[PDB]
Scaffold this active site. Structure first.
Site, PDB file in Angstrom:
ATOM      1  N   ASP A 273       0.845  -1.173   0.000  1.00 13.36           N
ATOM      2  CA  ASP A 273       0.000   0.000   0.000  1.00 13.36           C
ATOM      3  C   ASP A 273       0.894   1.241   0.000  1.00 13.36           C
ATOM      4  O   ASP A 273       1.498   1.571   1.029  1.00 13.36           O
ATOM      5  CB  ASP A 273      -0.896  -0.010   1.228  1.00 13.36           C
ATOM      6  CG  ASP A 273      -1.889   1.126   1.189  1.00 13.36           C
ATOM      7  OD1 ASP A 273      -2.952   0.942   0.567  1.00 13.36           O
ATOM      8  OD2 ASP A 273      -1.573   2.194   1.734  1.00 13.36           O
TER       9      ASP A 273
ATOM     10  N   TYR B 211       3.775   9.470  -0.134  1.00 19.59           N
ATOM     11  CA  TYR B 211       4.773   8.860   0.777  1.00 19.59           C
ATOM     12  C   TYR B 211       6.215   9.171   0.363  1.00 19.59           C
ATOM     13  O   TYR B 211       7.164   9.039   1.180  1.00 19.59           O
ATOM     14  CB  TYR B 211       4.542   7.346   0.926  1.00 19.59           C
ATOM     15  CG  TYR B 211       3.115   7.018   1.420  1.00 19.59           C
ATOM     16  CD1 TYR B 211       2.321   7.982   2.079  1.00 19.59           C
ATOM     17  CD2 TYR B 211       2.574   5.756   1.224  1.00 19.59           C
ATOM     18  CE1 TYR B 211       0.989   7.665   2.530  1.00 19.59           C
ATOM     19  CE2 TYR B 211       1.265   5.434   1.658  1.00 19.59           C
ATOM     20  CZ  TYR B 211       0.485   6.383   2.301  1.00 19.59           C
ATOM     21  OH  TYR B 211      -0.803   6.036   2.672  1.00 19.59           O
TER      22      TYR B 211
ATOM     23  N   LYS C 246      -1.857   6.085  -4.674  1.00 28.56           N
ATOM     24  CA  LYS C 246      -2.913   7.029  -4.426  1.00 28.56           C
ATOM     25  C   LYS C 246      -2.551   8.359  -5.071  1.00 28.56           C
ATOM     26  O   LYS C 246      -1.425   8.830  -4.973  1.00 28.56           O
ATOM     27  CB  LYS C 246      -3.086   7.240  -2.897  1.00 28.56           C
ATOM     28  CG  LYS C 246      -3.216   5.906  -2.125  1.00 28.56           C
ATOM     29  CD  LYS C 246      -3.528   6.164  -0.627  1.00 28.56           C
ATOM     30  CE  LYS C 246      -3.402   4.899   0.228  1.00 28.56           C
ATOM     31  NZ  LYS C 246      -1.968   4.553   0.533  1.00 28.56           N
TER      32      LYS C 246
ATOM     33  N   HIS D 196      -6.626   9.999  -2.919  1.00 27.66           N
ATOM     34  CA  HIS D 196      -6.139   9.977  -1.542  1.00 27.66           C
ATOM     35  C   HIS D 196      -7.044  10.683  -0.559  1.00 27.66           C
ATOM     36  O   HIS D 196      -7.260  10.172   0.541  1.00 27.66           O
ATOM     37  CB  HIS D 196      -4.695  10.541  -1.480  1.00 27.66           C
ATOM     38  CG  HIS D 196      -3.858   9.952  -0.384  1.00 27.66           C
ATOM     39  ND1 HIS D 196      -2.471   9.929  -0.430  1.00 27.66           N
ATOM     40  CD2 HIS D 196      -4.204   9.493   0.854  1.00 27.66           C
ATOM     41  CE1 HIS D 196      -2.000   9.494   0.734  1.00 27.66           C
ATOM     42  NE2 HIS D 196      -3.029   9.225   1.532  1.00 27.66           N
TER      43      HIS D 196
ATOM     44  N   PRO E 287      -4.029   5.469  17.723  1.00 22.38           N
ATOM     45  CA  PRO E 287      -3.089   6.574  17.952  1.00 22.38           C
ATOM     46  C   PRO E 287      -1.601   6.287  17.721  1.00 22.38           C
ATOM     47  O   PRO E 287      -0.819   7.211  17.530  1.00 22.38           O
ATOM     48  CB  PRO E 287      -3.374   6.973  19.405  1.00 22.38           C
ATOM     49  CG  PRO E 287      -3.712   5.633  20.055  1.00 22.38           C
ATOM     50  CD  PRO E 287      -4.670   5.058  18.993  1.00 22.38           C
TER      51      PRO E 287
ATOM     52  N   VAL F  80       1.381   8.847  17.263  1.00 23.39           N
ATOM     53  CA  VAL F  80       2.186   9.081  18.464  1.00 23.39           C
ATOM     54  C   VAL F  80       3.621   9.177  17.913  1.00 23.39           C
ATOM     55  O   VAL F  80       4.416  10.012  18.325  1.00 23.39           O
ATOM     56  CB  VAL F  80       2.095   7.879  19.448  1.00 23.39           C
ATOM     57  CG1 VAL F  80       3.402   7.723  20.201  1.00 23.39           C
ATOM     58  CG2 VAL F  80       0.946   8.080  20.431  1.00 23.39           C
TER      59      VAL F  80
END
Ligand code: NAD
Ligand code: NAD
Lengths: 319, 319
Positions: free
Chosen positions: B44, B49, B78, B111, B219, B223
């Site tokens: 993916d 990216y 995407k 996207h 998260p 994080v």
């Protein structure tokens, strides 16, 4: 005394109106006429309410008596879900114009971002949830923008002064703004302390779209229709937060509920179904809520929605 | 064995893939190559990216050594926000194809339902939030459907096998289905116990749209980016409910988190950044969660969203 809001279309729209959903046909005309004598000038109607001819009768009576002229009355109607295909949009508006007995409506809204299969007016009108196949829901492939362009053409033809949308979430309103030549002047959505949607309100207002709140009394309108969700919900009229703020200003909880919207530049169209409510519902702008009052009311937001197409047929409008 | 999901396009898509977001350019090739040796076949990726050339290096090395053939690899990419204007869609896709070193991508997704002003590849690539004017966001008036039609022509040209969307709320997906000739085969959205959006999942699956979940560990990925909201959020790995269930089955919290989505027919694309996680992240389908386990996990759904464009520039996608 009732302040006007200047829409992006350049036309003024009264900030306080008279709601016509569930206004009984037998008495709708008398109620609209009395609303006009009480000072109301905007009437929030819809093809789906099935009482446009009677709303039209009340306005005509006030005009015939010389109480008002057509240009002093603001008529809102809404295009129902079976009429989104461009070739049927003007047909539905013509029905609205013929029932209201006028040459143009002041505001015409896409009622929901849902396109039911077209049903001819001679077969059933208003169609409600009927889609031509017994009790089954049947939909048709009509993107919102095709319907919007059909509406834009009707503004150029002089049949509608301002156009807008109802029941659109932010992502949908944003995409429409990309294809619109006439920007939607109004976003009409369920708005009360249990469903505040502050980010939607902020985005639309910053875009110059005017908000009209419906069901300002939250569950009450739906309790009257025996809806389980609303019946299970504590009323806003007896909520301690609303009551404490009302007591502070020596106002009624209903006045606080309406002012809370009005003070933020949101138009209201309460259902005034008793003579006393007619007066109460247009005379609440007599005090100001403070930042602290807004912070206290902000705590009631729980994202509780009473008018949800998910309940009809799991239509994903709000998910 | 990783079960395949048959897409509405007719093509099979591995139900477990390897996430390429934040895969460092210096090691991306080797990591993708190792993932292939470990059995992964879906990757993916995305223009945003900024590592598609390296992902392409990893896939090419594996094909060159004969570990797999092109047809056995499923590459997802995407279309980034700056490339929604139809005339820029093929150029953006070609850049992706040239970087990945392939003639077609298996899945190409819009996207975000957001259209940033076009920025030439030579000026900045990937552009991220850059819109051609310093730090200012600048947008294009390009409706989603125009972009979608551009993608449909690319499927006809054989450059994309299946097309889909990411980060679309229900109302927007529904409107797209009304104008789409090739229906969106995949809806990729943030999906974990704190943001379950069960109605959106139910609607898309009933419409034949396959769900791919991202941020399956909640998260955690954010994080790892010092995001305030995510840092101030109890991790799903130490949450009592997840902990109890993992203990009950002698599974890691991560395995419970992945199976929770998989057992409901949702595809997963965990980012496996360590060798042991690589194996575990594709070998978790060895137990079934019970109706009670599901009931317990459902209580965590608080609608906490970590990837929200409202944080970028008050973009109303989810309001
Ligand atoms: N576009 C849409 O989908 C949509 C949906 C619902 C309503 N609307 C519009 O907005 C209008 C108002 O919303 P609503 O009809 O749901 O109801 P509302 O919230 O205005 O009023 C609900 C009920 O509260 C009571 N009430 C009114 N004034 C009161 C007062 N001063 N004190 C105590 N109780 C009082 C009445 O019994 C009334 O029926 C509708 O008539 C319609 O025009 C639009
Ligand atoms: N379309 C979109 O907007 C979008 C947005 C974000 C990510 N994605 C995609 O989905 C993928 C996965 O989502 P994600 O990367 O945000 O996060 P995730 O939830 O897959 O993983 C986040 C983190 O948890 C850790 N982790 C992974 N496996 C573990 C295990 N077995 N045990 C303990 N910790 C583990 C890693 O440190 C990792 O960085 C991405 O790589 C990307 O391909 C798509």
């Amino acid at each position: 005394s009732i302040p006007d809001i200047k829409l992006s279309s350049g036309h003024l729209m009264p900030s306080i109106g008279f709601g016509c959903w569930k206004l009984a046909n037998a008495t709708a005309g008398e109620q609209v006429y009395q609303a006009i004598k009480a000072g109301y000038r905007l009437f929030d109607g819809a093809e789906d309410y099935g009482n446009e001819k009677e709303v039209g009768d009340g306005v005509k009576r006030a005009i015939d008596e010389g109480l008002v002229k057509r240009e002093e009355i603001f008529l809102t109607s809404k295009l129902w879900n079976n009429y989104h295909d461009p070739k049927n949009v003007e047909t539905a508006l013509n029905k609205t114009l013929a029932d209201l007995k006028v040459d143009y409506v002041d505001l015409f809204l896409i009622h929901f971002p849902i396109a039911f299969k077209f049903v001819p007016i001679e077969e059933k009108y208003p169609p409600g949830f009927y889609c031509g196949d017994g009790n089954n829901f049947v939909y048709e492939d009509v993107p919102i923008l095709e319907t919007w362009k059909a509406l834009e053409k009707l503004v150029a033809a002089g049949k509608i002064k301002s156009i807008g949308v109802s029941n659109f979430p932010g992502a949908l309103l944003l995409d429409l703004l990309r294809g619109a030549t006439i920007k939607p002047a109004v976003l009409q959505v369920e708005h009360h302390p249990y469903l505040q949607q502050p980010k939607l309100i902020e985005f639309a207002q910053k875009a110059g779209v005017t908000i009209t709140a419906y069901s300002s009394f939250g569950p009450q309108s739906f309790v009257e229709m025996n809806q389980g969700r609303a019946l299970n919900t504590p009323t806003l009229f007896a909520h301690d937060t609303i009551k404490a703020i009302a007591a502070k200003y020596n106002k009624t909880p209903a006045e606080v509920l309406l002012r809370w919207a009005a003070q933020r530049g949101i138009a209201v169209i309460p259902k005034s179904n008793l003579p006393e409510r007619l007066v109460q519902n247009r005379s609440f702008n007599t005090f100001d809520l403070t930042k602290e009052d807004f912070e206290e009311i902000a705590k009631l937001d729980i994202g509780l929605r009473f008018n949800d197409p998910w309940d009809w047929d799991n239509i994903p409008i709000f998910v």
